[PDB]
Design a protein around this ligand. Structure first.
Ligand SMILES: [N+]
Length: 154
């Protein structure tokens, strides 16, 4: 099918590790292998992606990003390394999400509050899903969105 790459973007305290735990658990239940990596710089991402996303592995790769400022370059690096990867960016801030949407043609999702900033994000194509603070629902919602817009997830 191809690689599904999920960037999970947000500062410490955004729910990333719990969201990632829920995504891994649901994926195991569906018989799909998931691997995770946490990156702090664009080259770290290059290093791990150039090793891992070698031959469009049929796998889910989750990338944890604690520094939202690097998200865009890491997203671009993913596409550079594997132009045949599905890329889903789960972002904590609606403002970051809007900025990433403007700079990429990639699925960008917010589960997370300010109604005005959220509307602005959605206007640039940010997708909103229920399950902020409920990792299990969130994981379910993300998997449904990937199925409907990207493929089986198998
Ligand atoms: N919200």
């Amino acid at each position: 099918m191809g690689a599904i790459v999920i960037l999970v973007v947000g500062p410490p305290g955004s729910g990333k590790s719990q969201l990632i735990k829920a995504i891994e658990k649901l994926a195991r239940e569906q018989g799909q292998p998931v691997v995770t990596t946490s990156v702090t710089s664009e080259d770290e991402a290059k290093k791990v992606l150039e090793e891992l996303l070698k031959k469009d592995p049929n796998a889910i790769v989750v990338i944890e990003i604690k520094n939202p400022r690097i998200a865009e370059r890491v997203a671009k690096r993913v596409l550079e390394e594997d132009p045949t990867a599905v890329l889903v960016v789960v972002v904590s801030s609606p403002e970051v999400a809007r900025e990433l949407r403007e700079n990429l043609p990639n699925v960008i999702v917010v589960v997370l509050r300010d109604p005005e900033k959220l509307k602005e994000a959605k206007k640039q194509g940010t997708q909103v899903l229920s399950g902020d603070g409920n990792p299990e629902e969130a994981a379910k919602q993300i998997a449904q969105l990937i199925k409907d817009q990207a493929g089986s997830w198998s």
